[PDB]
Design a protein around this ligand. Sequence first.
Ligand SMILES: O=C(O)CCCC[C@@H]1SC[C@@H]2NC(=O)N[C@@H]21
Ligand SMILES: O=C(O)CCCC[C@@H]1SC[C@@H]2NC(=O)N[C@@H]21
Ligand SMILES: O=C(O)CCCC[C@@H]1SC[C@@H]2NC(=O)N[C@@H]21
Ligand SMILES: O=C(O)CCCC[C@@H]1SC[C@@H]2NC(=O)N[C@@H]21
Lengths: 121, 121, 121, 121
Amino acid sequence: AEAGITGTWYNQLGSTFIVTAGADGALTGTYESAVGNAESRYVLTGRYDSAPATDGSGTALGWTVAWKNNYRNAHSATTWSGQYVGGAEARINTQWLLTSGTTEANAWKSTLVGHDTFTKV
Amino acid sequence: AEAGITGTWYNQLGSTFIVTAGADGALTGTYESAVGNAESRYVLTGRYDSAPATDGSGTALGWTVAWKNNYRNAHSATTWSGQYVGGAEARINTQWLLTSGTTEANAWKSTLVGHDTFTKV
Amino acid sequence: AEAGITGTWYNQLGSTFIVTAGADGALTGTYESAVGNAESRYVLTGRYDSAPATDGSGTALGWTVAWKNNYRNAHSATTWSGQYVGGAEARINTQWLLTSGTTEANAWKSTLVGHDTFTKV
Amino acid sequence: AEAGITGTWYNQLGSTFIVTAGADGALTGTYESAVGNAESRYVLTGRYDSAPATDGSGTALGWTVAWKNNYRNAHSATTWSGQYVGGAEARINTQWLLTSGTTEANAWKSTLVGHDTFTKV
Ligand SMILES: O=C(O)CCCC[C@@H]1SC[C@@H]2NC(=O)N[C@@H]21
Ligand SMILES: O=C(O)CCCC[C@@H]1SC[C@@H]2NC(=O)N[C@@H]21
Ligand SMILES: O=C(O)CCCC[C@@H]1SC[C@@H]2NC(=O)N[C@@H]21
Ligand SMILES: O=C(O)CCCC[C@@H]1SC[C@@H]2NC(=O)N[C@@H]21
């Protein structure tokens, strides 16, 4: 879903996800979080199923953002794993994992889990 | 950890992860799974904290693989979120999310969760 | 939130959760799934924060269901971890982990992850 | 695995899990954490597959601990979802979700994810 995926999306927190789906299954763009140890735009890189089944199932995809830009460094990375669902109201349903660089003593508590829903709004 | 991260790594299942850490916090390479609906090498893309804290904490990183290559298409994507830990025995500790494109009726069961440990072996 | 938590709840899939919150932080009841390898009612057991903060934060709680009753056995267990949020429209926001008994060769793929929202409806 | 499961177990962090597996698929016992906002013993409640497959697959199980005892209250709950694996070196492989009661503004970051391995040691 190159055409489909490409665009500007917003999640339930007001975060902005600007993507471009390459023909070769590549995802590139920008991410800006409405919350956490972040400010402005961050670079994102990902991959998506460029030849989705024809039975009307969603398109599997994922992307990563290392929380470092010119303004700051949170020393953490988030990965979103979900599927794209086309139609009237297109959506991107995901689950994410946010990992903080920690000392070994604190690795037990290095990762958060949640889910975000994106819509063209 | 450009030097550190760059290399060939193996996880507890015998999977092979070949990465190159760019100066700009970019991760590119190849992934080959010892299990699941996969065969041969797949393209990977990710990001890592290119300016890790100096207190000896790990380096946050993540990558994605869309399970499609010339030989097959599993119509799924995996995202690994973890941290790189340097030293005598360098390691990459991660947690992953594997999402399958599904119909809406089956979205409840679209995603698996697990953890992989990588070592230069 | 004994009074609050006690009751019949439904999630986004039409599943029914009948709980009783004991004074001692115990949760007991029945669970019936609208999907998966299940039928009829299953026993549940859990625990909740019986002395929640007074700043208006949610109440942390969790419960488990081993997918075996008189009618069947799916040889799996689900654990829901979330928080109770009181008010006009009371809700229970959770994340769950569903683990299937597997052989060692297949342990990599033994666990699913998702989220359910419950309301008195 | 009543006999099998019943006992004292330790995870990779030095935490102690004392369980009793009831004939009816009930789990009761005590949990004491070597880390986090905890001290002494906490009550646990869970469920397990009391009639596991005969093909030598693991036994699915889960338990919860609300982090409140006489000494303190962390206003959080953990749920462990895994499987019991019998034999020479019996093990309990799990994944857990730790949820903190939070305000709505901070719900995005309410839950941690990790994995623990238990052995009779
Ligand atoms: O605190 C940092 O380490 C930066 C966190 C960035 C915000 C997180 S990523 C998951 C969730 N979805 C969003 O759009 N924002 C939060
Ligand atoms: O079945 C497919 O959809 C392909 C799955 C690929 C294998 C998974 S990704 C998580 C885990 N870590 C690995 O190295 N392999 C498995
Ligand atoms: O297939 C089995 O092993 C039984 C699965 C039971 C249904 C799951 S538990 C998570 C999700 N929430 C529900 O209410 N039902 C599904
Ligand atoms: O900080 C609190 O809220 C109490 C946390 C208790 C410790 C956690 S539960 C997951 C992990 N496994 C353990 O044995 N201890 C930690």
